[PDB]
Design a protein around this ligand. Structure first.
Ligand SMILES: *[C@@H]1O[C@H](CO)[C@@H](O[C@@H]2O[C@H](CO)[C@@H](O[C@@H]3O[C@H](CO[C@H]4O[C@H](CO)[C@@H](O)[C@H](O[C@H]5O[C@H](CO)[C@@H](O)[C@H](O)[C@@H]5O)[C@@H]4O)[C@@H](O)[C@H](O[C@H]4O[C@H](CO)[C@@H](O)[C@H](O)[C@@H]4O[C@H]4O[C@H](CO)[C@@H](O)[C@H](O)[C@@H]4O[C@H]4O[C@H](CO)[C@@H](O)[C@H](O[C@H]5O[C@H](CO)[C@@H](O)[C@H](O)[C@H]5O)[C@@H]4O)[C@@H]3O)[C@H](O)[C@H]2NC(C)=O)[C@H](O)[C@H]1NC(C)=O
Ligand SMILES: *[C@@H]1O[C@H](CO)[C@@H](O[C@@H]2O[C@H](CO)[C@@H](O[C@@H]3O[C@H](CO[C@H]4O[C@H](CO)[C@@H](O)[C@H](O[C@H]5O[C@H](CO)[C@@H](O)[C@H](O)[C@@H]5O[C@H]5O[C@H](CO)[C@@H](O)[C@H](O)[C@@H]5O)[C@@H]4O)[C@@H](O)[C@H](O[C@H]4O[C@H](CO)[C@@H](O)[C@H](O)[C@@H]4O)[C@@H]3O)[C@H](O)[C@H]2NC(C)=O)[C@H](O)[C@H]1NC(C)=O
Ligand SMILES: *[C@@H]1O[C@H](CO)[C@@H](O[C@@H]2O[C@H](CO)[C@@H](O)[C@H](O)[C@H]2NC(C)=O)[C@H](O)[C@H]1NC(C)=O
Ligand SMILES: CC(C)S[C@@H]1O[C@H](CO)[C@H](O)[C@H](O)[C@H]1O
Ligand SMILES: *[C@@H]1O[C@H](CO)[C@@H](O)[C@H](O)[C@H]1NC(C)=O
Ligand SMILES: *[C@@H]1O[C@H](CO)[C@@H](O)[C@H](O)[C@H]1NC(C)=O
Length: 986
């Protein structure tokens, strides 16, 4: 790596530059494959843009786009085109991360299952691995090359590989010819923007100056609280990073300090704590302490992993997680933005994008008792000669929940000052951190200093507006250099409030002190107006940007200090636009509120909200106060217990009349799997036959030699898998599973056999996905699914032979549903036939009345070990044009009940794997778009009873959240194919 290849995106020691403008890149992670509704990408981008972010980072999952080797497919819900269109419509730029290896808590870490048939070590220069990646990278890097900013699209940065940071003992690391082959595949496909990487810690791998294999910008990661959410109020001793500014200078001083993945929540395993508990550990207090600690090191490329997580639909997840990927993130799985951490993150994003002096100040070592007399606080300075200083204040023990009183002694253009200058003490309450400034520019005005934090500021036609905030009951002080210009007449004017005090010095510096509360203070100094609010009021302010013109209109006038309107009130402001003499606002409301508009453009005299004209009062400052109609209705949804349910047996294999002559034979006498050498006469691994998704079945034939025989069976499905075994139609037993078991050794007696007669063993093995491969040189993704070993012995000790057949999803790598993708279906009978699809063939099902002997409802269930599938029509007629109403399906977990596993289907898409004896998930959200809110829907529930007594669902209900009055763009329903009879099915 030797410099940029184009002039649109460039960099230096301090920052990136875009179209020649220095910018702080503040980015959120979103994964397109975890939200398969193209018309909702714009809703998520409106919510990230309103935080004050300018960028989104995204993975691409190889396993979804090349499920058959040699056939790349990215159409319909798998296309990136509507994701790229929505980024341009919202005015957001993108960091593309296509792998080939992505980790991401997805099945295989992104590697398709057919890589288990590749002999050489993954993520090395073994030639069989390298040549297996060539077709995927050629197609995906060419799609992303067309969407680059150099061709008028949103793509500004590209990451090759993922977290390439160490290796197993006796494996070459770093392997520099391997790193350079990965970079060459991307360059050869047309990628010309800069390359960035994401090292696990500051190890220096791939940094500029390391020769063969190096990227353009060196990046690293940080997850200082780790991933166990057991104790959400405990922060470890020594858990805060204090060496990253020095480590950056030691490794790559020539490029911007970059955190390519920094903690925005945590993943959670089967048997874990739930994402509500993860959101309480990684909360608004975590954000203000740890994120301002990264600003104290001078970060200028900063991405939050995850910002919106979405859902692991259609088996796309790994065994180490379950269906939800909410992550405890700032935007929830259902797209609501009510968590307090969303409102706190907005305060930080709007401050940085109005503060260009931050980029060029130089960070220095942390100090104690230098910038304050107090030794109970620590202060890290960022210094510059004239353009402004910043100071990040925290408790000396970073974990402290105590309140500290303090003063500061700060350098300014008027000399060193102890502040407050008008008397009194500052306060730092528990788990808080503050940025104080000196010589901070506000358009044509200058703040000599401020202790209160800056939300936003802008210059308008008739005034300049500044918005400052403090936590409630905190004393704050700030000073403004002479705001009156020439006039030795002019004086301050108090417009609102009775707590603020104003003192003027003889050189006309104006000093203001106030105590923050619910009651806003407002003061006018000449044409400068200052609004002084508490933190909780600042949470409801918004700063939408005014559009420019042409294809790039949503990117506004510039990325830093853009033309804007300031709005006080509302659950979300999405956008503003000018049309003749009217200002038009798109907004969402979850509660009643007025709206106050500050900074009306010149010549505008009418107001509309969501397409409707309304009147307004005018304040003496020229702000407009308006009262939109907000009705929040009572919503009624259909009761699921009252639908007309139909039922079909989904284990016909154990019946005497069953014909398996269409099933694949398991007759491979050798395997290419080098990680798990064969212990059996033939391979019983699903991936050796093309089956990589969901449940597997095996059928083993033997001739009885004695009346009693003993069976040893070793099975493997991934963490929290289960397996069940039948001998003809007789149930033998289940391994019922637990969070800590990925494999099981079982021993069963097969009794009462007739000598000389043929018997068939049916073995069902669930898979919860393919494992990741995060240590290069340990091929852990190749751990097989199915049967690892077995022995069948007569009562005299002789060995008895078994011959085998097997199946996963119908067709394997030749998968049948091209619209919904290669992983959506597993191998259970109802899936192979397509009976999960809309408009199923009801003459192949049964119907009977609930709470009777012949019930066809999942609330009544089945009375023996086995597997049944249930389907019903669900009509919806909700006011989706005017309201956003989030819907979810809820299972009741009733302490005393037999163990079972369930699968949830909606309009043909699998939207849940429920495991009653492992948990933690009971509530399953499904998005508008997969659901039709004004038409018929088809719902599906598979039920697998693990014990001899059978099982039932104790309760199942549809739940709504409080409705949101909405100005989003309309959601289009995803039109997946309905049932059609499948030729060659079994
Ligand atoms: C419906 O409601 C019912 C209740 O009526 C719910 O059922 C209950 O569900 C829970 C949760 O699944 C069950 O509790 C777990 O049981 C596990 C199996 O225990 C059996 O097998 C054990 C192993 O052989 C055996 O030791 C056990 O013996 C003990 O307990 C029995 C009591 O039955 C007793 O007789 C014995 O004397 C002995 O004391 C037992 O026979 C068990 O493995 C689980 O252990 C974990 O939790 C407890 C703490 O809560 C710990 O003390 C353990 O050390 C262990 O800790 C791991 O897991 C937690 C939680 O995630 C984590 O915080 C730990 O750090 C540790 O993590 C690591 O291991 C786990 C695997 O165990 C991995 O997943 C992790 O992996 C990832 O995570 C890391 C970050 O954390 C990340 O860094 C890694 O990269 C990543 O891989 C870590 O490796 C529990 O005890 C109940 O048994 C069950 N109760 C009943 C009555 O049935 C049901 O869940 C509900 N359903 C729904 C839908 O909600
Ligand atoms: C419509 O949409 C809006 C958003 O637009 C939603 O409003 C949000 O609703 C959520 C859910 O209720 C709110 O979050 C929860 O907030 C509570 C209440 O505490 C907050 O508000 C009060 C003012 O009423 C503040 O005083 C609180 O701040 C103090 O306490 C916190 C510690 O919690 C501390 O960090 C602060 O610095 C501050 O401490 C100072 O004062 C205290 C006095 O107590 C003093 O002792 C100390 O020394 C300092 O002086 C806070 O801002 C809060 O209890 C909850 O937290 C708990 O749970 C979460 C997990 O869920 C944990 O992370 C946490 O650790 C706690 O255990 C939540 O944070 C959110 O604030 C609110 N947002 C807005 C903008 O209003 C609506 O809900 C939506 N409505 C519908 C119908 O959809
Ligand atoms: C730093 O401050 C934290 C939080 O106040 C201290 O954590 C407390 O530690 C004590 C004793 O270990 C416990 O009884 C409390 O329950 C802890 N509180 C919380 C919120 O976790 C911590 O001990 C201090 N560490 C140092 C090195 O002083
Ligand atoms: C521990 C990190 C440095 S690797 C980091 O971990 C994340 C955890 O959610 C995801 O798996 C990312 O894909 C991986 O890059
Ligand atoms: C193993 O490797 C080679 C790759 O060329 C392939 O031709 C062969 O069919 C594979 N064998 C098995 C058992 O997968
Ligand atoms: C099962 O038994 C074999 C010995 O046959 C042993 O090698 C393996 O570790 C065991 N697996 C489990 C999950 O106990």
């Amino acid at each position: 790596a030797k410099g940029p290849l184009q002039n649109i995106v460039t960099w230096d020691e301090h920052s990136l530059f875009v179209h020649g403008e220095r910018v702080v890149i503040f980015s959120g992670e979103v994964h397109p494959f975890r939200l398969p509704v193209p018309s909702l990408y714009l809703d998520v981008f409106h919510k990230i843009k309103a935080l004050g972010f300018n960028t989104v980072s995204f993975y691409v999952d190889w396993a979804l786009l090349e499920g058959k080797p040699g056939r790349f497919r990215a159409d319909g819900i798998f296309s990136l085109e509507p994701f790229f269109e929505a980024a341009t419509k919202a005015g957001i730029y993108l960091l593309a991360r296509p792998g080939p290896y992505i980790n991401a808590e997805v099945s295989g870490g992104g590697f398709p299952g057919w890589l288990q048939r590749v002999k050489g070590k993954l993520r090395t220069d073994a030639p069989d691995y390298l040549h297996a990646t060539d077709n995927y990278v050629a197609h995906i890097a060419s799609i992303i090359a067309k969407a680059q900013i150099t061709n008028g699209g949103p793509v500004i940065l590209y990451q090759p590989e993922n977290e390439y940071s160490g290796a197993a003992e006796g494996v070459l690391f770093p392997n520099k010819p391997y790193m350079q082959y990965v970079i060459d595949q991307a360059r050869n496909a047309g990628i010309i923007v800069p390359l960035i990487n994401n090292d696990a810690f500051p190890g220096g791998t791939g940094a500029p100056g390391t020769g063969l294999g190096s990227v353009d910008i060196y990046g690293h990661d940080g997850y200082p609280l780790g991933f166990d959410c057991a104790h959400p109020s405990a922060w470890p001793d020594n858990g805060l990073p204090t060496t990253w500014r020095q480590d950056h200078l030691n490794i790559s001083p020539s490029t911007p300090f970059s955190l390519v993945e920094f903690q925005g929540g945590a993943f959670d395993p089967f048997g874990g704590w739930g994402f509500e508990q993860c959101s309480a550990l990684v909360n608004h207090e975590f954000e203000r302490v740890f994120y301002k600690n990264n600003m104290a090191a001078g970060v200028t490329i900063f991405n939050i992993y995850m910002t919106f997580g979405g859902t692991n639909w259609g088996n796309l997840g790994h065994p180490g997680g379950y269906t939800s990927y909410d992550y405890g993130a700032s935007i929830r799985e259902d797209r609501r933005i009510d968590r307090e951490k969303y409102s706190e993150l907005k305060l930080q994003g709007q401050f940085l994008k109005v503060s260009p002096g931050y980029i060029t100040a130089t960070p220095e070592n942390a100090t104690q008792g230098v910038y304050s007399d107090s030794q109970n606080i620590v202060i890290t300075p960022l210094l510059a000669k004239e353009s402004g200083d910043f100071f990040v204040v925290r408790h000396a023990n970073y974990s402290s929940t105590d309140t500290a009183s303090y003063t500061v002694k700060l350098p300014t253009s008027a000399g060193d000052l102890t502040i407050p200058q008008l008397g009194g003490s500052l306060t730092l309450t528990g788990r808080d951190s503050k940025i104080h400034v000196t010589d901070y520019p506000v358009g044509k005005f200058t703040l000599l200093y401020s202790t209160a934090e800056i939300f936003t500021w802008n210059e308008f036609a008739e005034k300049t507006v500044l918005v400052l905030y403090g936590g409630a009951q905190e004393l704050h002080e700030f000073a403004v250099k002479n705001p009156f210009g020439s006039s030795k007449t002019a004086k301050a004017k108090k417009i609102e409030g009775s707590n603020v005090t104003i003192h003027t010095t003889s050189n006309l510096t104006v000093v203001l002190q106030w105590t923050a509360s619910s009651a806003r203070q407002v003061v006018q100094l000449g044409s400068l107006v200052i609004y002084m609010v508490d933190r909780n009021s600042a949470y409801n302010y918004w700063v939408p940007t005014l559009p420019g013109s042409g294809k790039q209109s949503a990117y506004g006038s510039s990325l830093m200090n853009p033309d804007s309107v300031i709005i006080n009130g509302g659950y979300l402001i999405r956008s503003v636009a000018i049309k003749g003499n009217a200002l038009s606002v798109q907004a969402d409301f979850n509660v009643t509120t007025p709206l106050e508009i500050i900074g009306i453009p010149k010549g505008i005299s009418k107001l509309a909200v969501n397409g409707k004209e309304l009147g307004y009062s005018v304040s003496e400052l020229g702000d407009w106060i308006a009262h939109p109609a907000i009705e929040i209705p009572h919503v009624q949804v259909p009761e699921l217990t009252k639908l007309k349910w139909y039922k079909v047996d989904s284990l016909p294999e154990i019946r005497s009349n069953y014909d398996d002559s269409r099933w694949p034979l398991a007759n491979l006498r050798t395997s290419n799997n080098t990680y798990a050498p064969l212990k059996t006469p033939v391979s019983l691994y699903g991936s050796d036959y093309g089956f990589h998704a969901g449940t597997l079945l095996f059928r083993g034939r033997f001739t009885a030699r004695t009346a009693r025989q003993q069976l040893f069976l070793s099975t493997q499905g991934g963490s929290a898998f289960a397996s069940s075994v039948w001998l003809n139609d007789r149930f033998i037993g289940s391994f019922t599973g637990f969070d800590a078991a990925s494999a099981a050794n079982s021993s069963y007696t097969l009794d009462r056999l007739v000598r000389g007669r043929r018997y068939i063993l049916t073995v069902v093995v669930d898979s919860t996905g393919l494992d990741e491969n995060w240590t290069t040189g340990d091929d852990s993704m190749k751990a097989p699914r199915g049967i690892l070993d077995y022995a069948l012995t007569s009562s005299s000790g002789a060995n008895v032979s078994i011959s085998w057949k097997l199946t996963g999803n119908l067709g394997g790598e030749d998968y049948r549903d091209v619209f919904r993708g290669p992983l959506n279906e597993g191998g259970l009978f109802f899936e192979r036939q397509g009976f999960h699809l809309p408009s199923p063939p009801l003459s192949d099902f049964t119907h009977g009345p609930s709470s009777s002997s012949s019930s066809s409802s999942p609330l009544d269930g089945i009375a023996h070990a086995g597997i049944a599938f249930y389907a019903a029509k669900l009509p919806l007629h909700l006011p989706a044009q005017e309201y956003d109403i989030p819907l979810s399906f809820v299972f009741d977990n009733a302490t005393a009940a037999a163990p079972y596993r369930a699968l949830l289907y909606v309009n043909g898409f699998q939207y849940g794997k429920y495991v009653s004896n492992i948990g933690p998930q009971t509530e399953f959200p499904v998005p508008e778009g997969i659901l039709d809110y004004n038409g018929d829907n088809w719902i599906g529930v598979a039920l697998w009873a693990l014990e001899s007594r059978g099982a039932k669902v104790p309760g199942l209900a549809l739940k709504s959240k409080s409705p949101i009055l909405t100005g989003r763009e309309r959601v289009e329903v995803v039109k997946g194919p309905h049932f059609k009879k499948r030729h060659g099915a079994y």
